[PDB]
């Protein structure tokens, strides 16, 4: 992960284009996505990690 953040900083745009264009890979390509969130402070967390903190009542 200490290198992954350098790779993602350089090649994030290509990685997004894969989600736009590859209907086959995208389910697996999204797992490589990182975002800021209100509760992730100044760090980016994966969408799967987001669920780990998801409230019992959230559907979305």
């Amino acid at each position: 992960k200490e290198n992954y953040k350098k790779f993602y900083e350089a090649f994030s745009k290509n990685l997004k284009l894969g989600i736009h264009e590859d209907s086959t890979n995208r389910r697996r390509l999204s797992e490589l996505l990182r975002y800021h969130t209100s509760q992730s402070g100044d760090e980016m967390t994966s969408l799967s990690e987001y669920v780990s903190r998801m409230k019992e009542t959230q559907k979305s």
Binding site: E2, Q39, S40, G41, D42, E43
Partner: protein, 168 residues
């Protein structure tokens, strides 16, 4: 303040930090896993750094002091940050420990791999030893110094960029 008050994570395998005025035993601990070359958790590194900032922002607008009679000077000139240099000054003298005037009159934050770590412990000591511990600007502690000798990016790898903005 907001980031810490949100407690994104609270504590870590190395440090045990207090809310403010970290114990001398924890400042000792922090130094002895800088020998092990570990880091603080981001919230606890912020927790000391915002408290240090507040104290430094209150402290006299420029410092003039009458030094007392029996007390013995320790001075560093430039000590471009290195962990062995910290160990070696603890060979050169006893502990600063509110017991000896300790003046750090130097370039510290630049031209050595352990350079944020030097200021992280020395800032801790300034909170705990305020009255006769005085830490003066190098030129090399200034903003652009960190670009030319890479410390700006060295912090940015070690921690996300806002840490380096606080150090600047």
């Amino acid at each position: 303040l907001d980031i810490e008050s949100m407690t994104i994570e609270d504590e870590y395998s190395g440090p045990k930090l207090e809310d403010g005025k970290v114990t001398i035993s924890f400042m000792k601990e922090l130094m002895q896993w800088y020998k092990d070359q570990k880091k603080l958790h981001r919230k606890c590194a912020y927790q000391i750094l915002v408290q240090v900032k507040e104290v430094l922002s209150k402290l006299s607008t420029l410092v003039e002091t009458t030094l007392k009679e029996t007390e013995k000077i320790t001075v560093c000139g430039d000590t471009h940050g290195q962990f062995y240099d910290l160990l070696n000054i603890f060979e050169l003298n006893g502990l600063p420990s509110e017991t000896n005037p300790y003046i750090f009159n130097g370039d510290f934050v630049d031209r050595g791999s352990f350079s944020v770590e030097v200021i992280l412990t020395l800032f801790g000591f300034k909170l705990l030893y305020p009255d006769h511990f005085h830490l003066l600007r190098g030129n090399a502690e200034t903003d652009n110094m960190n670009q030319i000798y890479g410390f700006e990016g060295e912090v940015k790898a070690k921690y996300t960029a806002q840490m380096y903005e606080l150090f600047s």
